[PDB]
Design a protein around this ligand. Structure first.
Ligand SMILES: NC(=O)c1ccc[n+]([C@@H]2O[C@H](COP(=O)([O-])OP(=O)(O)OC[C@H]3O[C@@H](n4cnc5c(N)ncnc54)[C@H](OP(=O)(O)O)[C@@H]3O)[C@@H](O)[C@H]2O)c1
Ligand SMILES: NC(=O)c1ccc[n+]([C@@H]2O[C@H](COP(=O)([O-])OP(=O)(O)OC[C@H]3O[C@@H](n4cnc5c(N)ncnc54)[C@H](OP(=O)(O)O)[C@@H]3O)[C@@H](O)[C@H]2O)c1
Ligand SMILES: NC(=O)c1ccc[n+]([C@@H]2O[C@H](COP(=O)([O-])OP(=O)(O)OC[C@H]3O[C@@H](n4cnc5c(N)ncnc54)[C@H](OP(=O)(O)O)[C@@H]3O)[C@@H](O)[C@H]2O)c1
Ligand SMILES: NC(=O)c1ccc[n+]([C@@H]2O[C@H](COP(=O)([O-])OP(=O)(O)OC[C@H]3O[C@@H](n4cnc5c(N)ncnc54)[C@H](OP(=O)(O)O)[C@@H]3O)[C@@H](O)[C@H]2O)c1
Ligand SMILES: CCCCCCc1ccc(Oc2ccccc2N)c(O)c1
Ligand SMILES: CCCCCCc1ccc(Oc2ccccc2N)c(O)c1
Ligand SMILES: CCCCCCc1ccc(Oc2ccccc2N)c(O)c1
Ligand SMILES: CCCCCCc1ccc(Oc2ccccc2N)c(O)c1
Ligand SMILES: N[C@@H](CCC(=O)O)C(=O)O
Ligand SMILES: N[C@@H](CCC(=O)O)C(=O)O
Ligand SMILES: N[C@@H](CCC(=O)O)C(=O)O
Ligand SMILES: N[C@@H](CCC(=O)O)C(=O)O
Ligand SMILES: N[C@@H](CCC(=O)O)C(=O)O
Lengths: 255, 254, 254, 255
């Protein structure tokens, strides 16, 4: 897994604790050129500060709010003009309203339900469609999911149904883009202390249950999602598509 | 035996609807049935199809599941008219036709979100409203397709809406379980219906089922109805969060 | 309604066996019932338990499923005595107690193979022999546990046997499907039985079900019985190679 | 990856086309010390000739029939004494009688059935038990499976039920050895032309179906399984255990 002469777009860094910064440090250390997308100007300010830890000689930064077709379309097109063709996209983007990450799922509003779908699942479909234009030789696209996608986890609620939708999105994109040699896959990460994790009810007690109950008896971190991302995004994983790799101390496998 | 049971059946359009197969089976088991419909033609179709059933009266409500208010008022009127219900059969899905053929990666945001709204979110607001009519518990069944579990050619945006539906069922089962409301899905094999005409490559898939599925034949609406009767009755009292494939065994092979 | 149906039920040891749950329900629905047992003690228990059923006669056959000869002769004798049958409920498993606690990685070879033989292989041979007694179709159900789908502390050698049993169901479904023989599984939640007493950590699991599973209660043998009746009747036509969890929704959550 | 100063045991090379030789070329390229185990004297012969293609400076070959506890126990003890501690095991071993790999599964004999379980699933348990003693610090164990363990595949019959058992074995071993920092996983390989594959009914038909239907529209090869093995056997997959990674052109993800 030497990645010199590769270029990857990383979507969804907000600060030093983001899962996408884990990916970024791993890829950067393997020699990749990196392009970052963000939403909030605060995330750009964090990226400028974090970029000083990386070996990248150039800040390639683009504001993409994935709710806007125009911004995705113009964002990727612009990326293609500044760096030319890419080898892969790491997608690390989800959002739901805090009301909807606690209490009763049956009480979820239409607008909350569709908001999480839009940002957390559809963004992947239109990103694949646009990033595909920069991968005429093929490449690799990886999104971040959680076990809540496969089973009902108390409190994860509307996000779990968005992650179900995302994981199917990965399977349908993989079938669609396979003949173009673009592999599509998901990493199912265990709980990691990030900014978004702060909004999820019961997150702390899940972290503890992982330590007690998961095969490795410990929580995973961002760099460990990064290591698996490096695998998924490179030729080491050349025959692998439509797959979901749980980076979660084995927790998915037990009951 | 379903006498003194009352069930709301959403999503009959014509004689071929999966929901009419459920209706005949419940009706034949002695249940009292209430029906919900979107289009005017389905009311008309319904009024004529009801002559085949045993129902001594025609309890019909127009509900478009895209409107909260219609679902809310609908179920409020059902309560006022009929009393407490024992369950809900949800047989509703939609996507635009261009989205059911060609490249999934080309799906529009509108088309993607439409399908989620009608095909997945609707179960959630239905379950919320119907719960008010089930104070001593009941049973909610939704209809899905193997396409929510695996990427099936052409099924595209509906596959991702079904994956969403199937998780919606799990989260509702967890949430509503303490109220003794069970929520399950029937994953139906391919059956010729109004909507089935709209899915790219449906005929080819029909034939593959007979060639390749363990039972070597296709299923029909009455077979979905029979498993609905199970899920909606006390025979399934211990079962919730489940997805039962009524598909000649096709899910189990590869 | 199962009048004029005949089912073989394998693996009743006493009044708490899951298979007795199945028996009561089928008996209540009018089925003619044949029983198989291994231990002397289990026949005695069976003779007493029949006084609770409407079975007008006692059809008891000793079959140790470790013996090909006993399964072949047992089923051939059942055919001479009652004619064609409509299906088989398989409620048989076994492992040595030291393989239901401690470290899985320390399982012996004979212990591993013993559990496979009795708990999984036995279905293949029963299905072969019983096929002979169903020229017209039927239904075969085996009993499994969620520890065949996930690693569950202590369940150890039996979980690997259940993984193998649930695959056995799928291959039998595929093989016997053209013959109109359906093959399915019930994945039952924990239930206090004689066998359950030898599994490390059983009470802990039973209690976690009440706290964590969607229905927040445990299931019992009669609820297994009820889903068994569905899977063994025409209500489940079109369903084969399936695993239905009767476990209060525990399988759907994490 | 980079595997210098790592030592791996590879079980189940028969000839140049064995999946396990794919695994060996990739690890050897990456700097690992390799120890090889075989059953037939013919496999040892092949092994000795295939070693000239490899960078290994030293042949470490051990006869182990996994039907015998003593050969497993003694084999690993001797490996122990000869090379010191090891970093993981690649398990590439299965067997079923020809009788049982075609026609009707319901006709499978008890002896055929238990034979497939004993060699194809139990072997992993005892290997893991014996290999653990050589991994005081942790390590990684990988077994090779096939999609017919998750779904009924026509003709794969008794071996399907053995692969189910194997895939459960991997989860139960992951739960058990996790606290020792030993990870255990499976690679679900797509159809590959091997000695053993010649005895499976309908194998050519499936090859063709993969090319027509699988997302990547092509079959995979031994090196592609090797490359995912290097991922699983190395630190890149820290955090991953009890997992099954399909190297099969996305075929598992579609219906
Ligand atoms: N932490 C965990 O335990 C965990 C576990 C499993 C999976 N995941 C998944 O990991 C991914 C990364 O989340 P995280 O935990 O690392 O949280 P995070 O650091 O808060 O990152 C989430 C990112 O989502 C971006 N985002 C939200 N809406 C967006 C929009 N409309 N357009 C563009 N970007 C948008 C945010 O950008 P702005 O801040 O600039 O708005 C932010 O950078 C998510 O997909 C999450 O579901 C997290
Ligand atoms: N047929 C199959 O092979 C198959 C297989 C597996 C699963 N399914 C599922 O079975 C269910 C029923 O479909 P079907 O095949 O029986 O086709 P159908 O007869 O065309 O029924 C679809 C129903 O959905 C209703 N519907 C659509 N949007 C609605 C809305 N916004 N509000 C209220 N009702 C709405 C339609 O009502 P109007 O026409 O009145 O608008 C129609 O009654 C669907 O969920 C489908 O996904 C079908
Ligand atoms: N209880 C639970 O929580 C639970 C949960 C999930 C699934 N299950 C499954 O349910 C089934 C029934 O078990 P149970 O809990 O009802 O326990 P049980 O009452 O103790 O019954 C187990 C039966 O297996 C029979 N059996 C064992 N070895 C046999 C052999 N060599 N030949 C013929 N019969 C043999 C026993 O007969 P003899 O007494 O004559 O030896 C006994 O009747 C098993 O498959 C079990 O794995 C149980
Ligand atoms: N080829 C495929 O399409 C495919 C697909 C998915 C998974 N797999 C799996 O890949 C693994 C390797 O098989 P393969 O396809 O590479 O075929 P292969 O080259 O024939 O290798 C199978 C190996 O199994 C060994 N083996 C069998 N019984 C043994 C015993 N009792 N003790 C020790 N070794 C024994 C054989 O050694 P001897 O020659 O010395 O007897 C041989 O080296 C198997 O687990 C297989 O199920 C294969
Ligand atoms: C009850 C479950 C607790 C464990 C949750 C782990 C986790 C933490 C953070 C996650 O990321 C988001 C969650 C909601 C909204 C946006 C994001 N990025 C996320 O997707 C998953
Ligand atoms: C290539 C796949 C062919 C098999 C499709 C079977 C099917 C048929 C009808 C279905 O129902 C709908 C499909 C789309 C839009 C609305 C509905 N109700 C549906 O959800 C599934
Ligand atoms: C640690 C897991 C706790 C829950 C176990 C539930 C259970 C209980 C009894 C079961 O039946 C047997 C178990 C072992 C040996 C034989 C049988 N019949 C069985 O198969 C499963
Ligand atoms: C009907 C579907 C055909 C596809 C089979 C692919 C395959 C090929 C070879 C395999 O390896 C064995 C199979 C049987 C016996 C021993 C081995 N090693 C194996 O395990 C799987
Ligand atoms: N802050 C709470 C959730 C808030 C609640 O709804 O009580 C937690 O993380 O546990
Ligand atoms: N498991 C119970 C047995 C109770 C009984 O069967 O008497 C105990 O150990 O006391
Ligand atoms: N009899 C105890 C012992 C636990 C064990 O050591 O297996 C139990 O059932 O949990
Ligand atoms: N050698 C034949 C066997 C045919 C059969 O499965 O019986 C094949 O591989 O196709
Ligand atoms: N990767 C190292 C450490 C083991 C582990 O990843 O658990 C090895 O295989 O030696």
């Amino acid at each position: 897994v030497n990645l010199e002469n590769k270029t990857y777009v990383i979507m969804g860094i907000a600060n030093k604790r983001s899962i996408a910064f884990g990916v970024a440090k791993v890829l950067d250390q393997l020699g990749a050129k990196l392009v970052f997308t963000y939403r909030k100007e605060r995330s750009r300010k964090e990226l400028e500060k974090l970029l000083e830890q990386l070996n990248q000689p150039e800040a390639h930064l683009y504001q993409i709010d994935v709710q806007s077709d125009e911004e995705v379309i113009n964002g990727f097109e612009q990326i293609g003009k500044d760096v030319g063709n890419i080898d892969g996209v790491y997608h690390s983007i989800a959002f739901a309203n805090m009301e909807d990450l606690r209490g009763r799922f049956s009480e979820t509003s239409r607008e909350g339900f569709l908001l999480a779908q839009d940002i957390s699942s559809y963004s992947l479909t239109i990103v694949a469609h646009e990033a595909k234009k920069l991968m005429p030789e093929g490449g690799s696209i990886v999104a971040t999911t959680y076990l809540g996608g496969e089973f009902a986890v108390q409190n994860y609620n509307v996000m779990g149904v968005a992650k179900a939708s995302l994981e199917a999105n990965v399977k349908y994109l993989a079938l669609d883009l396979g003949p173009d040699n673009i592999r599509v896959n998901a990493i199912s990460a265990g709980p990691i202390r990030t900014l978004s994790a702060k909004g999820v009810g019961g997150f702390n007690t899940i972290l503890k249950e992982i330590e007690e109950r998961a095969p490795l008896k410990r929580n995973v971190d961002q760099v460990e999602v990064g290591k698996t991302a490096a695998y998924l995004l490179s030729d080491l994983s050349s025959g692998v598509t439509g797959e979901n790799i749980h980076v979660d101390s084995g927790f998915h496998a037990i009951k």
